[PDB]
């Protein structure tokens, strides 16, 4: 349901 | 903190949101 | 938020979304109280009856948001958590007494038109405004009804309710660290916080200095927007000594 967030924030 | 609670798009430019008056009216 | 309306752009620039990394989903609301401190409900992070026990690395905070699900490029800012502090006397076993937690960000967030901290009340502002009948404002991306989910941040204004009416509405033991708000059955109007609004702010605009103060944190309720039930909120001022102690020693 949620738009993916930039990978930098999941690193 | 000095500037807390003052919204850039409202208080800071002296614009009121659509329902804040409802709050003020309740503060009797 | 049940029976509320779409927030205006920048209406609640202290609003924070607590976001789970995996799976990517809304966990709770929260509020920005400085450039590196976020306030929320303890039950957003710790609730053993439902096997909830989040650690710093499980979560992200998303600040400056309006849309619930979109990645709001160039507007929202996403922060990592350095550390979580839960009130040491948070009562998850019984009645969610002292339902409060702080989160320190790894890096300060830059303020903008969409990102700005709310004030915490002093004793005097609390005494003046925390009165039955006086209205505050609750905001969140939680459910639109008890039993769907909004496109954008929702807002509702609700009156503080007399303590005996709060107590008489429920079998749960109410404490001085809680207050309740919402319309009575006879009053016609309605509205309430709901699941997903947890941890978000109940704010009031001081008529003395025109600043917004966070008086409450969305804590608990029996269902959502039920006639004769009220929403319960953590009493922020009553727990402010703990707040200051945490910020003073760790900030
Ligand atoms: C004291 C506590 C045991 C009561 C409990 N009630 S509950 O009905 O399960 C809350 C609820 C969950 C899902 C959908 C709707 C409502 C509750 O509110 N809890 C149990 C543990 C966390 C907290 C919670 O869900 N808070 C979110 C919340 C829900 C509703 C409201 C409201 N104002 N109506 C506020 C916060
Ligand atoms: C929750 O998780 C922490 C860290 O893994 C753990 O030490 C703690 O005992 C758990 N339960 C709590 C904090 O109630
Ligand atoms: Na009772
Ligand atoms: Na109700």
PDB file of N, CA and C in Angstrom, chain A:
ATOM      1  N   UNK A   1       0.829  -1.200   0.000  1.00  0.00           N
ATOM      2  CA  UNK A   1       0.000   0.000   0.000  1.00  0.00           C
ATOM      3  C   UNK A   1       0.867   1.256   0.000  1.00  0.00           C
ATOM      4  N   UNK A   2       2.049   1.147   0.595  1.00  0.00           N
ATOM      5  CA  UNK A   2       2.957   2.282   0.713  1.00  0.00           C
ATOM      6  C   UNK A   2       3.971   2.351  -0.424  1.00  0.00           C
ATOM      7  N   UNK A   3       4.210   3.560  -0.912  1.00  0.00           N
ATOM      8  CA  UNK A   3       5.236   3.794  -1.917  1.00  0.00           C
ATOM      9  C   UNK A   3       6.606   3.538  -1.301  1.00  0.00           C
ATOM     10  N   UNK A   4       7.477   2.876  -2.054  1.00  0.00           N
ATOM     11  CA  UNK A   4       8.809   2.551  -1.564  1.00  0.00           C
ATOM     12  C   UNK A   4       9.589   3.824  -1.257  1.00  0.00           C
ATOM     13  N   UNK A   5      10.390   3.783  -0.200  1.00  0.00           N
ATOM     14  CA  UNK A   5      11.215   4.929   0.144  1.00  0.00           C
ATOM     15  C   UNK A   5      12.645   4.713  -0.345  1.00  0.00           C
ATOM     16  N   UNK A   6      13.367   5.811  -0.607  1.00  0.00           N
ATOM     17  CA  UNK A   6      14.749   5.724  -1.087  1.00  0.00           C
ATOM     18  C   UNK A   6      15.577   4.749  -0.252  1.00  0.00           C
ATOM     19  N   UNK A   7      16.356   3.906  -0.922  1.00  0.00           N
ATOM     20  CA  UNK A   7      17.119   2.863  -0.242  1.00  0.00           C
ATOM     21  C   UNK A   7      18.066   3.417   0.816  1.00  0.00           C
ATOM     22  N   UNK A   8      18.517   4.652   0.626  1.00  0.00           N
ATOM     23  CA  UNK A   8      19.440   5.273   1.571  1.00  0.00           C
ATOM     24  C   UNK A   8      18.915   5.238   3.006  1.00  0.00           C
ATOM     25  N   UNK A   9      17.594   5.236   3.164  1.00  0.00           N
ATOM     26  CA  UNK A   9      17.003   5.264   4.496  1.00  0.00           C
ATOM     27  C   UNK A   9      16.834   3.908   5.104  1.00  0.00           C
ATOM     28  N   UNK A  10      17.049   2.866   4.311  1.00  0.00           N
ATOM     29  CA  UNK A  10      16.902   1.500   4.793  1.00  0.00           C
ATOM     30  C   UNK A  10      18.262   0.836   4.979  1.00  0.00           C
ATOM     31  N   UNK A  11      19.301   1.468   4.441  1.00  0.00           N
ATOM     32  CA  UNK A  11      20.659   0.947   4.549  1.00  0.00           C
ATOM     33  C   UNK A  11      21.081   0.805   6.010  1.00  0.00           C
TER      34      UNK A  11
END
